[PDB]
Structure formats: structure tokens, C-alpha cells
Amino acid sequence: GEIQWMRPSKEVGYPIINAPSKTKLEPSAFHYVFEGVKEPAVLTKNDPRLKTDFEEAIFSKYVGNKITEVDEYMKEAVDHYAGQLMSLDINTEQMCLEDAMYGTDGLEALDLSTSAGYPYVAMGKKKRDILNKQTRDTKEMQKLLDTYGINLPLVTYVKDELRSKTKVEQGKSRLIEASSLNDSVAMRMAFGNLYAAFHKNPGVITGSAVGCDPDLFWSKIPVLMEEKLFAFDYTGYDASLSPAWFEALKMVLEKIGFGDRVDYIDYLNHSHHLYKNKTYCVKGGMPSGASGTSIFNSMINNLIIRTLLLKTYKGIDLDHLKMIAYGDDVIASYPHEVDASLLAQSGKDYGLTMTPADKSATFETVTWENVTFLKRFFRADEKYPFLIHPVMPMKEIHESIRWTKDPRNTQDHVRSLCLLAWHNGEEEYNKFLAKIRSVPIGRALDLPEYSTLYRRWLDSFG
RNA sequence: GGGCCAGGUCUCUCUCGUCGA
RNA sequence: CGACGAGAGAGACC
């Protein structure tokens, strides 16, 4: 991905966007009870914790493109992957407008608590003003399609989130591209039946995790995996993706029957952006919050691993590759050990910057003891070894609890962390309930015991 | 609430129900 | 006990 040009949105006639200036995150009643080192991400240039120039930093993720042409490995990569997907018999029909707005089986209705994007943002208009779940009226939206059409600009916002010290100082905040209400709808009409099929079939056919519930699914994953595992992290995955990869994705969509819509993918590759007082074009790089970003990032992720294995390990039977991706995250198996250090080198020639898994120092062998997925570990239950605990380390749970976006919700917030935390096992869990209760607000909460959660978990296989 | 923020998945909580044994 | 509808509110993850 590469910024093609930038300039004052007034030079062009685009309005300014009101970006918020201060975080919703504040220290919580538990801020001093636990240990943490994360703070709210930098949101603006004036932020005193900056150790460099903000806009320089936030936009630095676009490293540039590596390749414009789809290689022969990619082409095969495509063929194989499209092959898998064909086995799902995926409905290729356009989705009806009423469903793309208000939802249907396998696809959730649009969120009316979020923005409608450009141009509606600027008129001060809102999603609730065009959609009505009660009537499920489509007539008004249709006119807005007729009016403003599609391929509208993405409105770019800073992600408001807990981030590590250096990343705070270094100003490396994450970005969010706000899809036009018009484009989400066109996308859903074009690909809704695609999205729903993925939502319905998380696993090793789709190669996607979207739609899994880690509490139940963790126990199914080892069963689907081949004998040996490999894995790695990506650097700035989204903003590295070279336009070649989009062309590959388009090929997959033709090959599985979505040939006419492969144009929509073009708007994701060559996008135009509003950001406060500025405006810019980007070539390459998946836009953070466009319709289908989870699905397409996973699909391209499926093509990358197939490609890299080919231009590295000749005579690899991609039929015995078993992977699951959530966007850039991935867990992958094969019958013989494979060398992430080796695939990492290949990746370089594709604009992909691939580091060792679990932020490790040097490349290492992945086992069921040290593999992570969606930030969880795998630990077999001590009494039912075919049941696998998704294990969120306490460390990340400690970080979360030390802040809040509204103390009014302190009970829900903490209750929700227990559901993650108890998989560390009774000892650490009761020590966690102890620390919560070591302050008065702690003791005002209704919290569940290990015995209760362990019971409910065991019962959900049933 | 603190001063106008995307696309999603899963989970939990409150209120109202449809079909269902 | 079993899907799912809407109205809310939140948490984690990508």
C-alpha cells in the first residue's frame, strides 16, 4: 500500500471531519489493585507523550507495494483455494436489498449505532434516519443509491484503544476507514451470500475463523489439524498487501462464480480517503473497516500461505495443508514440519514482512503448548483431555481491568473478564476474584464462582 | 457517562415477543 | 430445554 497523493480537503471541496480529540478511557477503581503498563493510544498531534511527528507516524504503515503482477505460484494458490471453496456450493446470486440492509440468515443487519459515513456525516444525517427495522423499508435507501451512487470516500479515524508504551510514544496509533453507508449496502448485496457462507462454515474449508466461539471451537481445532504446526506474525499486514493480491482475490471470486462483482474489490485497492482537513488516494492495502474486511483479509491470507509454500517447498500437497485465519492471525498445520524462517524469506519478495509468532525473538518450533490463536493458548482439561481450554493469559486481562469508558458498566466489564479468566484454572481464578474483592467496589459486584463456570462450560457440549 | 469515531465475530446483562416440545 | 425477533448496554478479539 502507498499514498498516491494528499492535499487540503478544501482545495477539492470536501468538508472537514470532526475527529474526537481525547480518549474515553480513564483509570478505573481497579487501576492500582493490578499491574499494567498500557495507556490510551495517541489521538492527536498536541499529545505531550509523543516522541515524533504524529501524522508522519500514523500514515507510515503504507510501506509501499512490492509486486503488480500475479506470479505462477499465486495463480496455482488461487486455483487450489477456489477449489476448496467450490466444495461449499456457495450461492452466487446477488443478495436482495432488503436483506443487505436489515439482515437475513448468516448475515447480521447493519448497525444503527455507527456512522453512515460520507456524505451523510457532513449533512449531519444518521443511519436510523434511513433504516427502520420495524417496517424494513427499503424505498428511501434505494434513492440514496440512485443519488450518490457508490465508490464513495472512506472517512479515516484514529482507533481509541489501549496500546503499549513505545507505540504510544512512537505515535503508532491504528487507523479506521469508515465505509460509506452506500458502499456497505452495495457490498452486502453483491457478496452477502458469500459472507453468510463463511459465517456458517468456520474451519479448514473456508480457511476462516469468523463465526467461531472459542469456548466450544477450541476443542474441535486439534481434530482438524495435521500433525505438525507452523505459525508467524505479520507486520502491518493490512497496509502491506500489494495490488497483485487483490487481483488474486478477484480471480478466486470469478472462479467461484462472483465474476461480475470483482469490480467492487477494485474500490478497496484504489481508495480515496478523508481525514480531518485532508484527502488522499491509496494504492494497495486493505482498508481497515470496509464491508467484508474480515472475510477478504482471511481469503488473501489463505492465498499467501499457499503461495509461500509453493515457492519454497516444491512437492507440497496443498491438499494436506490445514489452516484457519482470522484476518492476519493464523494457525496452520501440515504432516511434515515446515520452516517459518524459510517462508519468511520468500514473503519478503511479496511485500510481506513476517516475524516470529508470539513476538518471540528468533524463529522456533510451534507445538500445542506454545501456539496462540485470537490471543488464546491451548490447554487440555485435566479431567477431560479431549476438551481444550482457550486460555487468555491473566496479563492481558489485568491490562483491561485497569481502565474504563464508563464506570456505570463496571459490573458487566468485570463479569465479562471472569469468563475469559477462569480458563487459567481454579487457582489463578480464585486469586483474581480475591484481588477484585480487595477493594470495596469489588465486593459490590455479583460474580460467578469457578465451580459454576466449569459446570456451565462442560454442559455446553450437549 | 468522560470531551463527534468503521467493518465484523463471539460472549455476557436488561426489557419485550414469535414459533416450539 | 430449543432455535430468533426487536429495543437497549457492555466486554474481548480480528
Author numbering: 1 to 462
Would you copy out the relevant sentences from the publication that reported this structure?
The replication of positive-strand RNA viruses relies on virally encoded RNA-dependent RNA polymerases (RdRPs) that are capable of rapid and processive synthesis of the 7–14 kilobase viral genomes. To examine this in further detail and to validate the polymerase–RNA interactions seen in the initial poliovirus EC structures, we here present nine new coxsackievirus, rhinovirus, and poliovirus elongation complex structures at resolutions ranging from 2.1 to 2.9 Å. All the complexes feature an upstream RNA duplex that is pinched between the pinky finger and thumb domains such that the RNA exit channel is opened by ≈4 Å as compared to the polymerase alone structures. All of the complexes show the open conformation for the active site wherein the β-strands of motifs A and C are not hydrogen bonded together to fully form the RMM-fold that is commonly utilized by polymerase active sites.
Last, we further extended the length of the RNA duplex to 30 base pairs with a longer (GA)3 locking sequence in the r5 RNA and were able to obtain a third structure of the PV polymerase EC at 2.9 Å resolution (PV_r5). A CTP soak of the poliovirus 3Dpol PV_r5 crystal resulted in two nucleotide incorporation events and two translocation steps, giving a final state 1 structure that is essentially identical to the starting point, only with sequence variation in the RNA strands. The nearly opposite behavior is seen in the PV_r5 lattice, where one and two translocation steps in each EC leads to a systematic movement of one polymerase relative to the other that is accommodated by twisting and sliding movements at the RNA-RNA junction point. In contrast, the PV_r5 structure shows significant rotations of one EC relative to the other and repacking of the RNA-RNA junction as the crystal lattice is reshaped to accommodate the longer upstream duplex regions. 2Fo–Fc maps contoured at 2.0 σ are shown for the PV_r5 structures where addition of 2′-dCTP results in one incorporation and translocation event while CTP addition results in two cycles of incorporation and translocation. A comparison of all the RNA-RNA junctions, shown in Figure 3, reveals geometries ranging from fairly straight and essentially canonical coaxial stacking (PV_r3, CV_r2) to slightly offset helical ends (PV_r1) to highly distorted geometries with frayed ends (PV_r5+2).
